[PDB]
Amino acid sequence: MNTVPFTSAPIEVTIGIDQYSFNVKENQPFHGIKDIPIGHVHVIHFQHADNSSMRYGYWFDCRMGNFYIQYDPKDGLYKMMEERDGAKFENIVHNFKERQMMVSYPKIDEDDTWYNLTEFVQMDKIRKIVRKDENQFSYVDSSMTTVQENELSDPAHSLNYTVINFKSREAIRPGHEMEDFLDKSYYLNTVMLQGIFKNSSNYFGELQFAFLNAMFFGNYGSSLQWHAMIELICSSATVPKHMLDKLDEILYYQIKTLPEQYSDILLNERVWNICLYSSFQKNSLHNTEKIMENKYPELL
Amino acid sequence: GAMNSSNYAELFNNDIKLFVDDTNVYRVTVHKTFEGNVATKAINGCIFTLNPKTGHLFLKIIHTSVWAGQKRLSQLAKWKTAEEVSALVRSLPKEEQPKQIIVTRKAMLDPLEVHMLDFPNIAIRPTELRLPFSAAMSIDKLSDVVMKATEPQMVLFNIYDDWLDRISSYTAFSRLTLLLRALKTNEESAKMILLSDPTITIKSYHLWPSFTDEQWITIESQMRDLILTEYGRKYNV
């Protein structure tokens, strides 16, 4: 079990840790989050009580170093930082635990929700999508635009998701225009899986990361990326059976987790109707189709 | 975006553009089989690709052999249309290539955009206009060359004959759309109006009769009357 200590909480803020969230009052004696499961990436996220604009947060993996949060009164945000002195860090965490100033990561034993949302998500892959190589953790917020969004402005603060465009030379082989546009198997299997991602694990990792950025920060570009990666699989007539089975599970947990009240802005009606009812894979996503139909029958 | 009544004059500027109409590409007769089921027999079709400024018509004849052993023909027809327009653009010298292609039907946008990915600077556009280019097969000489084709063939016409010697491309296009609208609404009546007076003939190198300016005004009046009558019939108004 790992710990993310906080120097202090000078401003009133909703703090998220993965799918959990806690209200902290201005100058409340809060010194961080303990009992964080090792073996998973995590995201610690923030919405200021005084400006519900700019949800922001840090993707991190506690195996890659000792991380803490400290409010920066100049930049006006909770910043993640690395403590290189292991003994200074253990000493700080031990003190705060002894004084019970920390919230416990409130995992239910039965509950595989966070594993199911992050199964393929790797910190090394997050750091290639979010470039800031001097830190081992990754900052994301509501407003960050994708490399693709910037093509259609500051490249330093961009989400470097894999560009997917169904009406691109990359997606369409000369002389297979109709075939490649109506059945995207070539684009999925040769260009994206064999060519760019190398395997379905990295593809699902980016898909899962895109969803979580859409859900936790309302990052619009991430939502576009999550939908594009779903639609590329559903629009392919030839998909490995293991990828289809795994996609059904991935999407099931994403739909299960989505706040009911955010379905209207995080779910694209056209893509879901197409994927569940028109696409080649319309009969391959049983779990996902059952939860969508019972939870969001209005969208369909 | 879309071509409408508001941006009509753009058709007659000096930016090269083509209209593409796919409505006569896939044509069938529906008939009964011996077992009393229904079957289609394909007949020769054509892509109607028209420069509205010059009157140059690139009539790509679609021979029935292109459908042999193919499924989902109404869908393939859109993609075959897009392939043939793309091949026509690539065959033209750079300075003759269109800056814009306007499709008369929205179902052509994605097929043509995908075939023209090599031409990112050519704008593919829909139109709000209800253009009567479906009636192209009511022009006897175009109908004749399509039905006689025994293989795929491109035939070049000027759909305005020699009109641009006397009128602007705006007025030539208005005359053409009124003739095609008439032919589409009541073909027999339209063709009767055009050919009733045997003294006015069609030159061998033309599609339409050799009317004087005065006889065109009368013809155009008879076509407008034909169209309003048929409208009052259609709609009991």
Swiss-Prot record, chain A:
Q: Name one GO cellular component term.
A: U5 snRNP
Q: Where in the cell is it found?
A: Cytoplasm; Nucleus
The record's annotation in InterPro entries points to:
AAR2 (IPR007946), AAR2_C (IPR033648), AAR2_C_sf (IPR038514), Aar2_N (IPR033647), AAR2_N_sf (IPR038516)
UniProt record, GO biological process: spliceosomal snRNP assembly; spliceosomal tri-snRNP complex assembly
Modification Phosphothreonine occurs at: T257
Give the start-end ranges of region Leucine-zipper. 244-265
Cite the post-translational modification comment. Phosphorylated on serine and tyrosine residues.
Q: Which UniProt keywords apply?
A: Cytoplasm, mRNA processing, mRNA splicing, Nucleus, Phosphoprotein
Q: Gene3D superfamilies per the record?
A: 2.60.34.20, Aar2, C-terminal domain-like
Q: In the record, which positions carry Phosphoserine?
A: S236
Question: Would you say which domain of life the source belongs to?
Answer: Eukaryota
Asked whether the keyword Nucleus is assigned, the reply is yes
Additional remarks? Present with 7330 molecules/cell in log phase SD medium.
Q: How does it assemble?
A: Heterodimer. Interacts with PRP8 (via RNase H homology domain and MPN domain), competing with BRR2 for the same binding site. Component of a U5 snRNP complex that contains at least the U5 snRNA, PRP8, SNU114, AAR2, SMB1, SMD1, SMD2, SMD3, SME1, SMX2 and SMX3, but is not a component of the U4/U6-U5 tri-snRNP complex.
What is the role of this chain? Component of the U5 snRNP complex that is required for spliceosome assembly and for pre-mRNA splicing. Involved in splicing pre-mRNA of the A1 cistron and other genes that are important for cell growth.
What protein family is recorded?
Answer: Belongs to the AAR2 family.
Q: What is this protein called?
A: A1 cistron-splicing factor AAR2
Q: What is the lineage of its organism?
A: Eukaryota, Fungi, Dikarya, Ascomycota, Saccharomycotina
| Name of the encoding gene | AAR2
From Swiss-Prot, chain B:
Compartment(s) where it occurs, according to its Swiss-Prot or TrEMBL record: Nucleus
- Subunit architecture: Component of the U4/U6-U5 tri-snRNP complex composed of the U4, U6 and U5 snRNAs and at least PRP3, PRP4, PRP6, PRP8, PRP18, PRP31, PRP38, SNU13, SNU23, SNU66, SNU114, SPP381, SMB1, SMD1, SMD2, SMD3, SMX2, SMX3, LSM2, LSM3, LSM4, LSM5, LSM6, LSM7, LSM8, BRR2 and DIB1.
Task: Share the domain note from the entry.
Answer: The MPN (JAB/Mov34) domain has structural similarity with deubiquitinating enzymes, but lacks the residues that would bind the catalytic metal ion.
Task of the protein:
Functions as a scaffold that mediates the ordered assembly of spliceosomal proteins and snRNAs. Required for association of BRR2 with the spliceosomal U5 snRNP, and the subsequent assembly of the U4/U6-U5 tri-snRNP complex. Functions as a scaffold that positions spliceosomal U2, U5 and U6 snRNAs at splice sites on pre-mRNA substrates, so that splicing can occur. Interacts with both the 5' and the 3' splice site, as well as the branch region. Has a role in branch site-3' splice site selection. Associates with the branch site-3' splice 3'-exon region. Also has a role in cell cycle.
Q: What is the effect of changing D21A?
A: Alters protein folding. Severely impaired growth. Strongly reduced growth at 35 degrees Celsius
Organism field: Saccharomyces cerevisiae (strain ATCC 204508 / S288c) (Baker's yeast)
Q: Which residues of the full protein are shown?
A: 1836 to 2069 of 2413
What other facts are recorded? Present with 468 molecules/cell in log phase SD medium.
Changing T23A does what?
Answer: Reduced growth at 30 degrees Celsius. Strongly reduced growth at 16 degrees Celsius
UniProt protein name: Pre-mRNA-splicing factor 8
